[PDB]
């Protein structure tokens, strides 16, 4: 890390951004690179912008009433920034000080009197984990590996005195903005340090199942919700109560109607029917009405997969700040579901396109019925939905990873039997355009065990072997290594990897259910909702789709007073089973 | 199979409910120690595969079409065209491609049919491997003893039954039926080998027991005094 | 019984080794350390989310190994009697 800020310090000199000077180390200069060692969060405990420019603090530039040196603040110049006394919070930031020092122990004692009793844990835990990563090359990587679970396991311990006793307010524990750590939520930046065992603790997943209703509560079961689905007078039967209509506060059907749209599943269940139509209706467009003209089924396809492309896009308003355009894109990019979206809607500009135009009508349903496939991989992708059904869809995920040179290893093996196979013999059911297709399509469908009956229906020895010498290294090159590449998704299985499962399950949750519960064929209208909104108005401030929790700050100190109290009920007793190990006692 | 309009699912229905009897007759002869946990096995094997149903019956769906999507065939009339363009496409699962029927960039299809080829193999087949790394724990060595433990359940409920055969249990139901209306309450000979306990005899076991547990308490803290661990912690 | 009614008000209070003192003068000697073991089990798998639910996991198949020693003694010697004591009302 010193040898990161002498290089930040050169990645900031005296030119680019800190037009005066800057060869000498300074707070925002550490705050930067402490802003890499952070992801989606806000700037906390160190304030970077002009009311605190720690930038430009070495060469004379006048004071608070030109704002273009210093902290605007602080009366005085002085080649320093005064006497801002506890910036946000002290014992917060020696947590960075011992942990970018490597100071093992001496950080837990800092976490003793630490005011952010959980989310600081992670904090240690999660760059922790970016410089095992990082730079240490061994020794101490492998080491703050074998740190950071134990500092994850010190987060753990905090949610398990929270949560036995006043879980009401451990129940918001989850949810504060803090005014402490870049607000972040709590989950956010337990999402990003990957958490395999801290978000898999108990009354967490006893919390996200609080998460997964609202106002629409348990003793409703799977087979019939979706009898109230396509049935709306059947709601209204003996069959499934809100926790309103349990407390008989249904008077109006719109608040039976309005609440009922608000589920996380009830969105989830419509994408579950209205999206799959859409793909059994492809199949009855493409067998009967592939006609050029625009007819009232093919003004019907458009109706549905234009607006998939809004709810992309939508989800792409729902991405960013109100600040960045070009890097929520680039994020979007990255993810390797999100780069298989592209090619749903890329085949769909070429093959409609040959669907349209009277040249190329073979390519009209061939393209799109390899597009077909795009949607299917999507189709997996969100039918991943239940505790059975989701982590094996992940671990074809490290397989399929893995599988994009077993395509081309596959594509590599293949060819080299079919003209082989033909080169006993070039056949007869052939005319001038099926030379190309008779000694290449007839021999390479093969690989269904298809040799090509259709076709017919001196050492002869060779081929009977050369049978058996294809069928070994088709089985033992690519079927062995069917069960190697199985070998490296080996490890957790059962135990953890199905906690990893529900570790992004309420990632997909919170984006599945901050979605509008428009259909998109009316969708358009809530755009509309929205953009109409923007020339009635100026600046975006309208209703943003967020559950957060706005705290008051008197709200807050009879909160976070009494989770320090429980911090500290919490202190005596991590030091206990530290006594209480049997092997610290044969060290005493 | 009686109503003369339906003959054609009096055969079809029946031959589809002969395999819901297959299903019990595995259940019925997973009788032995080799035979036994494996068949369980291939229930958190078959109760995952619930879906694995329907995976593969969304799996499948997308080829048979595509693949007739090159050409509408013409083994084919009036209602072979939904039987033709469905069942002779997906009959072919078994490898078969339908050399019943026909006995400009053609790259593509011999790509795709390794693409199929592809995730049939890796994306059902390689979850064939990872749906047994779910019953990976203990087998030979205490899931074996989970089949004796799961033994017993069933050799109780199936020695608790009459030894007449079915076309003579009818003559057992009017053993105890018509000897309901000759009596008034049921207290007739039940089927259990249970075993009743006189309270003299009673208290020659179990004060015996008890002697047998002071003469096992003694042995139970001697191992926790023989462990060399509680000997460090002393 | 009042002993065997002891041995519940330790296990729903969570006290781990006096349980087995109230074991050790239980008149019931083999069913009682099962039903120590069995609800344990349930709260192992009900409600207690971390560090003891885990914990009284490994409590019950002591618990469980408790009951094991008592049929080693009953059966090695006179067996006959520890026919009989599978099928006890
Ligand atoms: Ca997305």
């Given at each position: 890390?010193?040898?990161?800020?002498?290089?930040?310090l050169?990645?900031?000199?005296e030119?680019?951004?800190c037009?005066?000077?800057?060869?000498?180390?300074?707070?925002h200069?550490?705050?930067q690179?402490?802003?890499?060692?952070?992801?989606?969060?806000?700037?906390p405990?160190?304030?970077?912008?002009?009311?605190?420019?720690?930038?430009?603090?070495?060469?004379?530039?006048?004071?608070?009433?030109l704002?273009?040196?210093?902290?605007?603040?602080?009366?005085?110049?002085?080649?320093s920034?005064?006497?801002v006394?506890?910036?946000?919070?002290?014992?917060?930031?020696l947590?960075?000080?011992?942990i970018?020092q490597?100071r093992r122990?001496?950080?837990?004692?800092?976490?003793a009197?630490?005011?952010?009793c959980?989310?600081a844990?992670?904090?240690?835990?999660?760059?922790?984990?970016?410089?095992?990563?990082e730079e240490?090359?061994?020794?101490s990587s492998?080491?703050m590996l074998?740190?950071?679970?134990?500092?994850?396991?010190?987060a753990?311990?905090?949610?398990?005195?929270?949560?036995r006793k006043?879980?009401?307010?451990?129940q918001?524990?989850?949810t504060?903005?803090?005014?402490?750590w870049?607000?972040?939520?709590?989950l956010?930046?337990?999402?990003?340090?990957?958490d395999?065992?801290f978000?898999?603790?108990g009354?967490?997943q006893?919390?996200?199942?609080?998460?997964?209703?609202?106002?629409?509560?348990?003793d409703?079961?799977?087979?019939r919700?979706?009898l109230?689905?396509?049935?709306?007078?059947?709601?209204?039967?003996?069959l499934?109560?809100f926790?309103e209509k349990?407390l008989?506060?249904?008077?109006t059907?719109?608040a039976?109607?309005?609440?009922?749209?608000?589920?996380?599943?009830?969105?989830?269940?419509?994408?579950?029917?209205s999206?799959?139509?859409?793909?059994?209706?492809?199949?009855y467009?493409?067998?009967?009405?592939f006609?050029?003209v625009?007819?009232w089924?093919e003004?019907?396809?458009?109706?549905?997969?234009?607006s998939?492309?809004?709810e992309?896009?939508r989800?792409?308003?729902?991405?960013?700040?109100?600040?960045?355009?070009?890097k929520?894109?680039?994020?979007?990019?990255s993810?390797?579901?999100?780069?298989?979206?592209?090619?749903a809607?890329?085949?769909?500009?070429?093959?409609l396109?040959?669907?349209?135009?009277?040249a190329t009508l073979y390519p009209?349903?061939?393209?799109?019925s390899?597009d077909?496939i795009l949607f299917?991989?999507?189709?997996?992708?969100?039918?991943?939905?239940?505790?059975?059904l989701g982590?094996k869809?992940?671990?074809?995920?490290?397989?399929m990873?893995?599988?994009?040179?077993?395509?081309?290893?596959?594509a590599?093996?293949?060819v080299?039997?079919?003209?082989?196979?033909?080169?006993?013999?070039?056949?007869?059911?052939?005319?001038?355009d099926?030379?190309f297709?008779?000694?290449?399509?007839?021999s390479?469908l093969?690989?269904?065990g298809?040799?090509?009956?259709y076709?017919?229906?001196?050492?002869?020895?060779?081929?009977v072997l050369?049978?058996?010498?294809?069928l070994?290294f088709?089985?033992?090159?690519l079927?062995?290594?069917?069960?190697?590449?199985?070998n490296?998704?080996?490890?957790?299985?059962?135990?953890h990897?199905?906690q990893?499962?529900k570790?992004?399950?309420?990632?997909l949750?919170?984006?599945?259910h901050?979605?509008?519960?428009?259909?998109?064929?009316?969708?358009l209208?809530?755009?509309?909702?929205?953009?109409?909104?923007?020339v009635?108005?100026?600046?975006?401030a309208?209703?943003?789709k967020?559950?957060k929790?706005?705290?008051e700050?008197?709200?807050?100190?009879?909160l976070?007073?009494?989770?320090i109290?429980?911090?500290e009920?919490?202190?005596?007793?991590?030091q206990?089973?530290?006594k209480?190990?049997?092997?610290?006692?044969?060290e005493?």
């Amino acid at each position: 890390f010193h040898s990161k800020l002498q290089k930040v310090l050169v990645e900031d000199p005296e030119r680019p951004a800190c037009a005066p000077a800057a060869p000498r180390l300074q707070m925002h200069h550490v705050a930067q690179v402490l802003r890499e060692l952070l992801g989606d969060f806000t700037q906390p405990l160190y304030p970077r912008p002009r009311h605190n420019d720690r930038l430009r603090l070495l060469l004379p530039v006048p004071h608070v009433k030109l704002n273009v040196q210093g902290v605007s603040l602080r009366s005085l110049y002085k080649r320093s920034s005064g006497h801002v006394t506890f910036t946000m919070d002290p014992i917060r930031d020696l947590l960075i000080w011992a942990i970018v020092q490597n100071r093992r122990e001496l950080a837990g004692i800092i976490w003793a009197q630490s005011q952010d009793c959980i989310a600081a844990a992670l904090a240690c835990s999660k760059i922790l984990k970016e410089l095992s990563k990082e730079e240490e090359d061994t020794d101490s990587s492998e080491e703050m590996l074998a740190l950071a679970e134990e500092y994850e396991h010190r987060a753990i311990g905090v949610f398990t005195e929270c949560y036995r006793k006043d879980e009401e307010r451990a129940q918001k524990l989850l949810t504060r903005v803090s005014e402490a750590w870049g607000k972040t939520t709590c989950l956010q930046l337990a999402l990003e340090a990957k958490d395999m065992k801290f978000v898999s603790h108990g009354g967490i997943q006893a919390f996200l199942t609080k998460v997964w209703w609202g106002q629409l509560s348990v003793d409703n079961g799977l087979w019939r919700v979706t009898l109230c689905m396509l049935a709306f007078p059947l709601l209204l039967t003996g069959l499934i109560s809100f926790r309103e209509k349990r407390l008989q506060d249904v008077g109006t059907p719109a608040a039976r109607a309005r609440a009922f749209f608000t589920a996380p599943v009830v969105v989830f269940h419509l994408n579950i029917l209205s999206y799959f139509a859409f793909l059994c209706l492809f199949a009855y467009v493409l067998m009967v009405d592939f006609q050029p003209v625009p007819s009232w089924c093919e003004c019907a396809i458009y109706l549905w997969l234009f607006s998939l492309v809004c709810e992309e896009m939508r989800q792409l308003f729902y991405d960013p700040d109100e600040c960045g355009l070009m890097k929520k894109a680039a994020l979007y990019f990255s993810d390797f579901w999100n780069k298989l979206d592209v090619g749903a809607i890329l085949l769909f500009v070429a093959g409609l396109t040959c669907r349209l135009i009277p040249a190329t009508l073979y390519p009209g349903r061939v393209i799109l019925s390899l597009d077909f496939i795009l949607f299917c991989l999507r189709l997996m992708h969100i039918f991943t939905i239940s505790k059975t059904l989701g982590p094996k869809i992940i671990i074809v995920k490290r397989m399929m990873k893995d599988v994009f040179f077993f395509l081309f290893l596959l594509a590599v093996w293949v060819v080299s039997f079919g003209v082989a196979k033909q080169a006993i013999l070039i056949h007869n059911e052939r005319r001038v355009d099926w030379l190309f297709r008779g000694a290449v399509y007839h021999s390479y469908l093969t690989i269904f065990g298809q040799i090509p009956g259709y076709i017919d229906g001196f050492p002869e020895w060779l081929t009977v072997l050369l049978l058996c010498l294809y069928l070994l290294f088709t089985n033992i090159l690519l079927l062995n290594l069917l069960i190697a590449m199985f070998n490296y998704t080996f490890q957790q299985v059962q135990e953890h990897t199905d906690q990893i499962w529900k570790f992004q399950r309420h990632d997909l949750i919170e984006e599945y259910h901050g979605r509008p519960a428009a259909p998109p064929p009316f969708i358009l209208l809530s755009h509309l909702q929205l953009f109409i909104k923007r020339v009635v108005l100026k600046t975006p401030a309208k209703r943003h789709k967020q559950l957060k929790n706005k705290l008051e700050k008197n709200e807050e100190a009879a909160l976070l007073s009494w989770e320090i109290y429980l911090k500290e009920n919490y202190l005596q007793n991590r030091q206990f089973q530290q006594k209480q190990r049997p092997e610290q006692k044969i060290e005493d």
